Amino acid sequence: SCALPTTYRWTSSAPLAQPKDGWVSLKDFTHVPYNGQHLVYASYHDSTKYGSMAFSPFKHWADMATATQTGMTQAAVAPTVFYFTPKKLWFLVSQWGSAPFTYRTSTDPTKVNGWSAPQPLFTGKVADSGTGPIDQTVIADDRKVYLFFVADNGKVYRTSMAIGDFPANFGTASEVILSDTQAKLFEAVQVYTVAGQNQYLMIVEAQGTNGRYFRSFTANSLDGEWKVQAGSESAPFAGKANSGASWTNDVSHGDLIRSNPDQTMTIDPCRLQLLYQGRDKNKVPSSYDLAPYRPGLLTLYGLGLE
């Protein structure tokens, strides 16, 4: 195995795709390996609203730029895709619409518009938030399925249910598991099982002075306490300080590359890669919702002598 490093260093791709005509951005990526291919769902923004989409399955990252971009006719903003092995079904979890978070199911997750009708997955609210719950992820161990989310408010939230109950509405309850400034625990929480390392990894997007960046935390169990791993802007999990990305100062909402598509959200720490959203650092400010986000890929450096 390969331990997660003390100090992260990455190289970056160029932007991996441009939005198709009529869209301004591609955002909030979720990726699974599927039949030897990359399967990516994402949010998009057009001139006026958010929606969701998938890319046609593609073998190589080089392929992403020409993959077909298909909008979902019932939006599934900020999606999470995985296979739930105890039901033999694929899940797509997302925000807004009929409930704060919803789930939908499929036997073939590549059917962009083939998912079941959305059902409530979470019906809670939280305090001191202008957005409410956003940016969920879902992850399980052998005992429970957990929902983690954020709220643009400096807090990370968690709820859970017994594994044998999933899927169902988690309900209204949630607990604060991490609390800091709004900037430090802002958006885009993700949680993973670290293969061969007997631990769990969380990343959370923060607003830095130089751009968006990710902060990492580790825990010994999904119901355990999270402790910071790489939390400063100058020595982050991933950010301008260590991304190797020349084109973007932001390293923002996406997904680590998972080694298998199931509910454990497993990553291979020997092949650590981040599918992120970035934006041209030289494009003058405009509204956030019109920001020209694009996919990018970070790949961790190999070990070296220095």
Closest approach, Cβ 295 to ligand FUB, in A, equals 12
Cβ proximity to ligand FUB: between 34 and 50 the closer is 50
SS3 164: helix
Among 39, 55, 135, 194, binds ligand FUB (CB under 6 A): 135
Closest approach, Cβ 179 to ligand FUB, in A, equals 19
- Print the binding letters for residues 222-261 with ligand FUB: x by CB under 6 A, - otherwise: -------------------------------x--------
Please state whether beta strands 266-267 and 187-194 pair in parallel, antiparallel, or not at all (unpaired): parallel
Closest approach, Cβ 164 to ligand FUB, in A, equals 30
SS3 64: helix
- Print the binding letters for residues 2-41 with ligand FUB: x by CB under 6 A, - otherwise: -------------------------xx-------------
Among 170, 187, 190, 298, binds ligand FUB (CB under 6 A): 187
Residues with Cβ within 8 Å of residue 158, at least 6 apart in sequence: 146, 147, 148, 174, 175, 177, 223
Residues with Cβ within 8 Å of residue 125, at least 6 apart in sequence: 100, 132, 133, 172
Q: If you ran DSSP here, which 8-state letter would residue 49 be given?
A: -
Cβ proximity to ligand FUB: between 187 and 233 the closer is 187
Among 17, 39, 75, 78, binds ligand FUB (CB under 6 A): 78
Q: Count Cβ atoms within 10 A of the Cβ of residue 180 and give its class: 0-12 exposed, 13-18 middle, 19 or more buried.
A: middle
Report the distance separating Cα 190 and Cα 238, nearest Å: 13
Q: Count Cβ atoms within 10 A of the Cβ of residue 283 and give its class: 0-12 exposed, 13-18 middle, 19 or more buried.
A: exposed
Closest approach, Cβ 299 to ligand FUB, in A, equals 22
Cβ proximity to ligand FUB: between 28 and 268 the closer is 28
